[PDB]
Amino acid sequence: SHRKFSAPRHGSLGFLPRKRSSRHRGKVKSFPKDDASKPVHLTAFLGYKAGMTHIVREVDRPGSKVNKKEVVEAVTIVETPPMVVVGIVGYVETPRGLRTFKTVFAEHISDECKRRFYKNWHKSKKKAFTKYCKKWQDDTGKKQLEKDFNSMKKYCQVIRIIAHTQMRLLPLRQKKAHLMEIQVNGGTVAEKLDWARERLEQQVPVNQVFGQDEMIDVIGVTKGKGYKGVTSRWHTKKLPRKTHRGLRKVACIGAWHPARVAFSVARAGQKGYHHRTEINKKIYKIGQGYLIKDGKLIKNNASTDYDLSDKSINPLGGFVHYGEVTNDFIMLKGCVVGTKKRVLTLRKSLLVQTKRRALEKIDLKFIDTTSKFGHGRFQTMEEKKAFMGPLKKDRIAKEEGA
Amino acid sequence: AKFRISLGLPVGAVINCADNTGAKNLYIISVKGIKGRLNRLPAAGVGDMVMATVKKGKPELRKKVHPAVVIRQRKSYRRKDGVFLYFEDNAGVIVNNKGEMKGSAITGPVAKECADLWPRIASNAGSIA
Amino acid sequence: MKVELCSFSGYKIYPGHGRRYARTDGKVFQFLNAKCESAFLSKRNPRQINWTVLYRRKHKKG
RNA sequence: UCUGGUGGAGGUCCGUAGCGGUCCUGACGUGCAAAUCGGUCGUCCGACCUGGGUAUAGGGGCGAAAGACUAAUCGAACCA
RNA sequence: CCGAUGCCGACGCUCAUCAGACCCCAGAAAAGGUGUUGGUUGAUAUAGACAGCAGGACCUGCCGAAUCAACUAGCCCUGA
RNA sequence: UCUGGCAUGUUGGAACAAUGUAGGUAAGGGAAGUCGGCAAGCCGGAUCCGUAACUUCGGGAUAAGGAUUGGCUCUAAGGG
RNA sequence: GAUGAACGAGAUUCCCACUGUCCCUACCUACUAUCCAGCGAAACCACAGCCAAGGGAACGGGCUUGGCGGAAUCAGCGGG
RNA sequence: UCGAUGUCGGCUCUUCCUAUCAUUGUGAAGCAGAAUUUACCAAGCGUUGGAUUGUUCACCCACUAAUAGGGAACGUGAGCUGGGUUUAGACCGUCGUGAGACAGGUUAGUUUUACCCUACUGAUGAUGUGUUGUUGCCAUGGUAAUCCUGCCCAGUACGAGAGGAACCGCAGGUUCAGACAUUUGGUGUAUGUGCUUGGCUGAGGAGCCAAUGGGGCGAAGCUACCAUCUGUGGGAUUAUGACUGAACGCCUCUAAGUCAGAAUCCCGCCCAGGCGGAACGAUACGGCAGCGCCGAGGAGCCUCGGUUGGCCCCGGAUAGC
Known part of the structure; x- marks a missing residue:
């Protein structure tokens, strides 16, 4: 008979499929549609999730109850050091799909990128690309490279760049770079190839891919949670207290007559570590990263034009379960997938951005920098020292020195 | 427009009556705007219209269904600008369908959310918290 | 962007922290965390708790 | 007649040991166990609990009575 | 599929935005169609048919050869 | 805890998933769950106050309701 | 027959208090389950084991016609 | 089907049907507006919280866009529960001389087994490309968003009045889905740091035991619509309304030929990734060796079989070439 009361x-x-993702790095499954009238540009980037904090800003939507009023918004910090271009891939369109036509690599590839080519770098002889690079130097090999760029020019419809992240600059145990194909959009195939060739072996900062207050897509793998019951995996109703043989389960897993368990019934299994793509994440800020100017280190990341506190995006005591953020970063509104240290894929939007929320220009008034290792209450160490005053450990040091 | 607020008062909650109509209790039996879902109790927060019944109070309004509006709640809720606010008690006042108060004075503070939604309730409030 | 002071500890409260407490008699208090909030609801006197600003001012520790 | 003491009755009350076995319709349910385990429960000076010795034997016994019990067998045991 | 029309087979009927496709047999009725195809009966039309162009208000002039009605029964469609 | 006794009740190592058995905690509501407050929870000792209907005058009665309770330093009274 | 204090692990209704019974679930702990060394059963078993429709003893794993079908396995699960 | 197919209802969960309550798009009215009724495409999405009853059913209270109806062994007991019905104890009424009966009422009354095959959920792996790795493509399968307020339009159109809309636009919310802890809350054996009862180590100091002694506050972690964030584009078309236009000298949305057209359908976005491909990299100690290319040069052997001249190409129309 019918379900007595309806419920979604x-x-x-x-x-x-709700399985473990077959990939640890997020995958771009659809790049933005190519428009030949637009200038040549990249469409994606690779970052790392450092942590979360909250900001203070004043909103500018006229008809709202928070119009011209100060709001607090959670944000996520994604550390994005520059990427290094190491290759070019060409694709041809066929009635069976897009097929890899020819890829060309740069002459010198760093050791951190070569680490991606080995499962045991310690035991390896590091012979990857040692014969390919010699082709860039030999005269016969140079002619073949030029012919191979020409064939890509006259046969390929899609051009991508192979780029990797620099893990020297990150405070992570891992030293092996993440490789990625980033599609080149805009212009003609010849213009794409010329753009790719000239910045081969070069560095692409994140500010040349993304801009301020633009709405981007985040691709990554969800936090893993292992084997889970139907109550946590699928959020089914818990059975009454006096149930025999189990409360945290689905009572009826199917009717008699189809005589099989359907694929649409909640079952216990793997939860988390799922590949996901969230689509509308606004860029609140693009940080500048630490730089040495006139012998002094500039820490001014996360100092707005209303506080001038001379502090860094780093909270007091550092990001928890992640080192210090010393490179360029992207501040996104809200939360993103993954653990800390999780590598995130940021790509440009596939949609046309026309709503007021997507087009509005945001300007932060304050950035929280209190410690996340507890109930932090001081923004800077200088603020804490001024409020607290001298301590016994300072007087002990003075006694030792004098 | 009113932003979403953490609900604290589901059906069956008894709250104080802050007006001077003679009612001392409001027993919430339903909430406006609630389509609902299976097994989910209708719930109300500050600024919400409810049907209540008077459990302790003057006899001439005890065995009937009254409209009421929640003005204070103990469940902390997040105002934008990131302020979590809660009150010492849950409270409401008896009103009609149009929102006009059956009483003439309100005891204690009135939340800013209910004051903005209901101007007549706000005008009778000693303070807005 | 106004910064409050805790009603029990006297500490500096930044915009996205703590809770606000409004009483039936119309008084509004600010609490840095639940440690200060619980002490206030226990009717504890901040002048007798060592780590509050009020205690340090009374004892002339600064 | 009232008041304050003394006194220590009771198939008296709370509640140990003991005797029993309410509910969870909990555990277990090819068990530790052919009836057990835990929490919670009833009674606990009496029509109380209990060892040994004695008497009643199958259409018979015994039964504060449930067709209960009568050697894991009872609306007539077991053995040939 | 699957042996056998890979006949230069014969005459028609029928288009279905739920087509139809073989005894028992495995699904449809009353009632309908200005879809199309036959058939029956009646009627008009050189003095002039039916159309159409208008007037008086059923008659006329202008185009100048087939037309109008009722029914019946095949396939298709609605009923489904 | 001592006298006395023992080696965790027919095995050990590693890990800390789902479901379970056993023990806890939970914001705001406060039985809206369910056949049913089942289960759990509230109360709980002692001292000082204060105790209703009804009644076979014995009771009900720890009815109900309220206050106190630590540590330390003293004081007064109670004997051979 | 009617009634009725005291009593009741007896059946029922409401009220206060209290609460994870519930909204709506979450986290923690011990013992398992888990994996390993050692030891090591039982129930059950025509052959076996992917579906849809058909017909059939009128609800097929096997037959007909379609859908299709890729070694060996692990932890769960309760449709068959 | 009686050498047994566990039985009422509820709870839980999935899918399906449409004879459509709402929502999308329409046609008709005794359609002025508002409200309503009739019909078409249409099952994508939604169809609630409670008092009484064991109940299905019913009835009422209250929200709502609506509170539509059904199936799946009258779905679903090795999923639960056991209130009812359906054993044995017992009570009442009526019937019977009685033992006893009641399609009458009442109260108490054991709910067993999965480790097997398949199904399904996840997890290793498999055959192939000489080995191995990186970057990628895609067949095919899954698929997701939903509804409502308020402001403005506007006290306007319409209407004698009473009343009283709608498209564009703005700000939000319900239901659902996917995540996430910066903040608030929960947990807390970091057994972290105070406090405290009983006992114990001669006492201090420092500790320990009471199956986590108890209690306060608690990091990290996990976690809550109990905090926060995000949720999307086209194509052919249905119903319908039309264009040109015969049949049928007029007419006609239909016959040939055109147009607009939707919560439906298909694709996209998203999830998975074939006994399915691609591009690229590196391809074996150093003294023993293996391996690659030159169609390498031959000579021979074993094995699996088939076959017994080739056609190296306009695009197409068909009442024309």
């Missing part, structure tokens, strides 16, 4: 089904079958 628990969960979505649009994420059906």
Whole structure:
């Protein structure tokens, strides 16, 4: 007979396989549609999730109850050191799909990028690309490279760059760079190839890919949670207290007559570590990263034009379960997938941005920098020293020195 | 427009009556705007219209269903600008369908959310918290 | 962007921290955290708790 | 007649040991166990609990009575 | 599929935005169609048919050869 | 805890997933759950106050309701 | 027959208090389950084991016609 | 089907049907507006919280866009529960001389087994490309968003009045989905740091035991619509309304030929990734060796089989070439 009272089904079958992701790095499954009239530009970047904090800003939507009023918004910090271009890939369109036509690599590839080519770098002889690079130097090999760029020019419809992150600059245990193909959009195939060739072996900062207050897409792998029951995996109703043989389960897993368990029934299994793509994340800020100017280190990241505190995006005591952020970073509104240290994929939007929320220009008034290792209450160490006063450890040091 | 607020008062909650109509209790039996979902109790926060019944109070309004508006709650809720606010008690006042108060004075503070939604309630409030 | 002071500890409260407490008699208090909030609801006197600003001012520790 | 003491009755009350076995319709349910385990429960000076010795034997016994019990067998045991 | 029309097979009917496709047999009725195809009966039309162009208010002039109605029964469609 | 006794009740190592058995805690509501407050929770000792209907005058009665309770330093009274 | 204090692990209704019974679930702990060394059963078993429709003893794993079908396995699960 | 197919209802969960309550797009009215009724495409999405009853059913209270109806062994007991019905104890009424009966009422009354095959959920792996790695493509399968307020339009159109809309636009919310802890809350054996009861180490100091002694505050972690963030584009078309236009000298949305057209459908976005491909990299100690290219040069052997001249190409129309 029919369900007595209607209720919507628990969960979505649009994420059906609900397994561990086969990849640790987020994958761009659709790049923005190419427009030949636009200038040549990149469409994606690779960052690392450092942590979360909250900001203070005043909003500018006229009809709202918070119009011209100060609001507090959670943000996420994604550390994005520059990427190094090491290759070019060409693709041809076929009635069977997009097929890899020819890839060309740069003459010198750093050791951190070569680490991606080995499962045991310690035991390896580091012979990757040692014969390929000699082709860039030999006269016969140079002619083949030029012919291979020409064939890409006259046969390829899609041009991508192979780029890797620099893990020397990150405070992570891992030293192996993440490689990625980033599609080049705009212009003609010839203009794409010329753009790619000239910045081969070069560095692409994140400010040349993304800009301020633009709405981007974040691709990554969700936090892993292991084996879980239907109560946590699919959020089914817990059975009564006096249930025999288990409360945290689905009572009826199917009717008699189809005589099989359907694929649409909640079952216990793997939860988390799922590949996900969230689509509308605004860029609140693009940090500048530490730089040495006139012998003094500039820490001015996360100093707005209303506080001038001379502090860094780093909270007091550092980001928890992540080192110090010393490179360029992207501040996104809200939360993003993954653990800390998780590598995130940031790509340009596939949609046309026309709503007021997406077009509004944001300007931070304050950035929280209190410690996340507890109930922090001091923005800077200088503020804490001024409020607290001299301590016993300072007087002890003075006694030792005098 | 009113932003979403942490709900603290589901159906069956008994709250204080802050007006001077003679009612001392408001027993919430339903909430406006609630489509609902299976097994989910309708819940109300500050600024919400409810049907209540008077459990302790003057006899001429005890065995009927009254409109009421929640003005104070103990469940802390997040105002924008990141302020979590809660009150010492849950309270409401008896009103009609149009929002006009059955009483003439309100005891204690009135939340800013309910004051903005209901101007007549706000005009009777000694303070806005 | 106004910064409050805790009603029990006297510490500096920044915009996204703590809770506000409004009483039935119309008084509004600010609490840096639940440690200060719980002490206030316990009717504890801040002048007798060592780590408050009020205690240090009374004892002339600064 | 009232008041304050003394006194220590009771198939008296709370509640140990003991005797029993309410509910969870909990545990277990090819068990530790052919009836057990835990929490919670009833009673606990009496029509109380208990060892040994004695008597009643199958259409018989015994039964504060449930067709209960009568050697894991009872609306007539077990053995040939 | 699957042996056998890979006949230069014969005459028609029928288009279905739920087509139809073989005894028992495995699904449809009353009632309908200005879809199309036959058939029956009646009627008009050189003095002039039916159309159409208008007037008087059923008649006329202008175009100048087939037309109008009722029914019936095949396939298709609605009923489904 | 001492006298006395023992080696954790027919095995050990590593890990800390789902479901379970056993023990806890939970914001705001406060039985809206459910056949049913089942389960759990509230109360709980002693001292000082204060105790209703009804009644077979014995009771009900720890009815209900309220206050106190630590540590330290003293004081007064109670005997051979 | 009617009634009725005291009593009741007896059946029922409401009220205060209290609460994870519930909104709506979450986290923690011990023992498992888990993996390993050692030891090591039982129930059950025509052959076996992917579906849809058909017909059939009128609800097929096997037959007909379609959909299709890729070694060996692990932890769970309760549709068959 | 009686050498047993566990049985009422509820709870939980999925899918399906449409004879459509709402929502999208329409046609008709005894459609002035508002409200309503009739019909078409249409099942994508939604269809609630409670008092009484074991109940299905019913009834009422209250919100709502609406509170539509159904199936799946009258779905679902090795999923639960056991209130009812359906054993044995017992009570009442009526019937019977009685033992006893009641399609009458009442109260108490054991809910067993998965480790097997498949199904499903996740997890290793498999055959192939000489080995191995990196970057990628895609067949095919899944698929997701939903509804409502307030402001303005506007006290306007419409209407004698009473009343009283709508498109564009703005600000939000419900339901659902996918995440996430900066903040608030929860947890807390970091057994972290105070406090405290009983006992114990001669006492201090320092500790320990009471199956986590108790309690306060608690980092990290996990976690809550109990905090926060995000949720999207096209194509062919249905119903319908039309264009040109015969049949049928007029007419006609239909016959040939055109147009607009939607919560439906298909694709996209998103999830997975074939006994399915691609581009690239590196390809074996150093003294023993293996391996690669030159169609390498031959000579021979074993094995699996088939076959017994080739066609190296306009695009197409068909009432024309």
